[PDB]
Write a protein that binds this ligand. Structure first.
Ligand SMILES: COc1nn(C)cc1C(=O)N[S@@]1(=O)=NC(=O)c2ccc3c(c2)N(C[C@@H]2CCO[C@H]2[C@@](CN2CCN4CCOC[C@@H]4C2)(OC)/C(F)=C/C[C@H](C)C1)C[C@@]1(CCCc2cc(Cl)ccc21)CO3
Ligand SMILES: OC[C@H]1O[C@H](O[C@H]2[C@H](O)[C@@H](O)[C@@H](O)O[C@@H]2CO)[C@H](O)[C@@H](O)[C@@H]1O
Length: 518
């Protein structure tokens, strides 16, 4: 479809101040005659990449910054180019959250971190440790109350505990992420998640508790504590619960480490209203009055706009938010975050329900989180060595035995496919007529159509990759060697995105090696 000209459609999550945002839209309309429509669809962060890929969707999308690198990598976002005067009005670390491959890809709005929220009438002093919560629940159950209820369906809420004793997503050292170094199934992560599962086993929490259940229980005074962000404070105010916002409990003497989000506003690359969107965001929303309108609906947290943040920073709930933020870590925005989150969401749900043990659940989450990088390493190396006739001497890195053995297996079975199907490979190569970087970009839809819609097995995966190597050899011959790495990335994307669940079920590339073991 085509995004309509002369209006703005905005998407924002249903937990945020969308009525306040609509009020800013009405002010925009008053000046310009342009109607602003604010919507809060379910699963908007999943919807957006689907609809935007076809040139459809909202003009402006709001989400935490972690999803935006994926959207940008997919060509779904307009580059943001504010002048120095405007840039200097927001905190530099907030612009850093929305920078991807050296370009600004959204406007930052506000810094979000989870805090412990407690009912002062039930618990005059909140617990400093996770370890004391079982005893406190036992005390409270004798009064017809519980200690703690929070959303167990979204890993954002359980991550602070998983991270506390050493769980991590992608290792960060010397100002750099090692995307090859994933910390989901280490001893620290296991300790955190085992503690959560034990809370459930011992009937201190219920695996089925979700956002709405926890919110209602806290706001009705049935549970003494919850874990939530600034957006939740409005409904708690309405409830008249005597609440405090404080630092999350420690685990094994170490701080809980929330993953810190920057609510951000991106502009759809397919929007014909980009100048209207820029005007709205810079001169209506990111002003004291614009942020106030949203904040009075549902609190934003620590806003990116220095002038308004100076007012808000006096609020002890914001101080608490920022204390927790400083103990946590800013989320990456790398495209791999979506997969990391899906993998950890499934692990927590399965461990909490008893569908899998903690060890089983975190193993699968490690494999899912490593899948893209490991797949790319194997596929890129095979294509490149096939094209040039010489292997890559660089170390395989993390899970290197698997990568090496997968590459050796792929050499055996993939060369066999190419050899036996040479005429068919030649025919398809000529039919596809691949000449340059632009023609390579067209192959994804063809790969999805042919590969992803057929039967899922290792044989057809070998064919996918083997035909890729055949194409790579051709590209080298015609002085298009620079196209090979983009080709490898494209094949990897199709494989891992469309066969994610199947691949994890096979133990990823270890399953491949096992399947073709001679
Ligand atoms: C015991 O059995 C086996 N052991 N082992 C080890 C393998 C098998 C086995 O049987 N495998 S098999 O079932 N696999 C497939 O069929 C298959 C799987 C994935 C594919 C993939 C195909 N394709 C079409 C092929 C390529 C050459 O001619 C093709 C084919 C079959 N195709 C199927 C789709 N139709 C659509 C209409 O036009 C004709 C076309 C024909 O042609 C005969 C072929 F060679 C199949 C042989 C496979 C080995 C059979 C390539 C593809 C689409 C093109 C773009 C593009 C680009 C890159 Cl970079 C990379 C890939 C692609 C997607 O990836
Ligand atoms: O649970 C995984 C989920 O976490 C974060 O989403 C948060 C969001 O940042 C908050 O603003 C609020 O809406 O709660 C969400 C959790 O339900 C990530 O931003 C998101 O990408 C991820 O899927």
């Amino acid at each position: 479809g085509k995004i309509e000209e002369g209006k703005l459609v905005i998407w924002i999550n249903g937990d945020k101040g969308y009525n306040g945002l609509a009020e800013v839209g009405k002010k925009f309309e008053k000046d310009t005659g342009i109607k602003v429509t604010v919507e809060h669809p379910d699963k908007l962060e999943e919807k957006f990449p689907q609809v935007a890929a076809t040139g459809d969707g909202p003009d402006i999308i709001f989400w935490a910054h972690d999803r935006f690198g994926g959207y940008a990598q997919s060509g779904l976002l307009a580059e943001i180019t504010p002048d120095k005067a405007f840039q200097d009005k927001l905190y530099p670390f907030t612009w850093d959250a929305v920078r991807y491959n050296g370009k600004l890809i959204a406007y930052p709005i506000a810094v979000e971190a989870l805090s412990l929220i407690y009912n002062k009438d039930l618990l005059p002093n909140p617990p400093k440790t996770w370890e004391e919560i079982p005893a406190l629940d036992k005390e409270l159950k004798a009064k017809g109350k519980s200690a703690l209820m929070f959303n167990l369906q979204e890993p954002y809420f359980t991550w602070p505990l998983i991270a506390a004793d050493g769980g991590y997503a992608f290792k960060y050292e010397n100002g750099k992420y090692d995307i090859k170094d994933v910390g989901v199934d280490n001893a620290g992560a296991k300790a955190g998640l085992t503690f959560l599962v034990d809370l459930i086993k011992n009937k201190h929490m219920n695996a089925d508790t979700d956002y709405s259940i926890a919110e209602a229980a806290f706001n009705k005074g049935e549970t003494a504590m919850t874990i939530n962000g600034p957006w939740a404070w409005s409904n708690i105010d309405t409830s008249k619960v005597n609440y405090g916002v404080t630092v999350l409990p420690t685990f094994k003497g170490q701080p809980s480490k929330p993953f810190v989000g920057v609510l951000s506003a991106g502009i759809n690359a397919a929007s014909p209203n980009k100048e209207l969107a820029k005007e709205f965001l810079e001169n209506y929303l990111l002003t004291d009055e614009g942020l106030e309108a949203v904040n009075k609906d549902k609190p934003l947290g620590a806003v990116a706009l220095k002038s308004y943040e100076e007012e808000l920073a006096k609020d002890p709930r914001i101080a608490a938010t920022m204390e927790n933020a400083q103990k946590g870590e800013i989320m990456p925005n790398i495209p791999q975050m979506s997969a990391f989150w899906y993998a950890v969401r499934t692990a927590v749900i399965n461990a909490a329900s008893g569908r899998q043990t903690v060890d089983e659940a975190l193993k699968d989450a490690q494999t899912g989180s490593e899948l893209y990088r490991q797949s790319l390493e194997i596929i890129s190396r095979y294509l490149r060595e096939q094209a040039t006739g010489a292997a890559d001497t660089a170390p395989m890195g993390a899970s290197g035995a698997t990568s090496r053995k997968a590459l050796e297996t792929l050499r055996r079975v993939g060369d066999g496919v190419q050899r036996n199907h040479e005429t068919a490979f030649q025919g398809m190569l000529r039919k596809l007529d691949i000449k340059n970087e632009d023609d390579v970009k067209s192959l994804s839809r063809v790969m999805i159509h042919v590969f992803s819609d057929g039967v899922t097995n290792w044989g057809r995966i070998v064919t996918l990759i083997s035909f890729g190597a055949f194409v790579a050899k051709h590209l080298k011959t015609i002085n298009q060697e620079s196209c090979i790495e983009p080709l490898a990335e494209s094949i990897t994307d199709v494989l891992v995105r469309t066969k994610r669940d199947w691949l994890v079920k096979q133990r990823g590339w270890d399953g491949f090696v096992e399947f073709f073991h001679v």
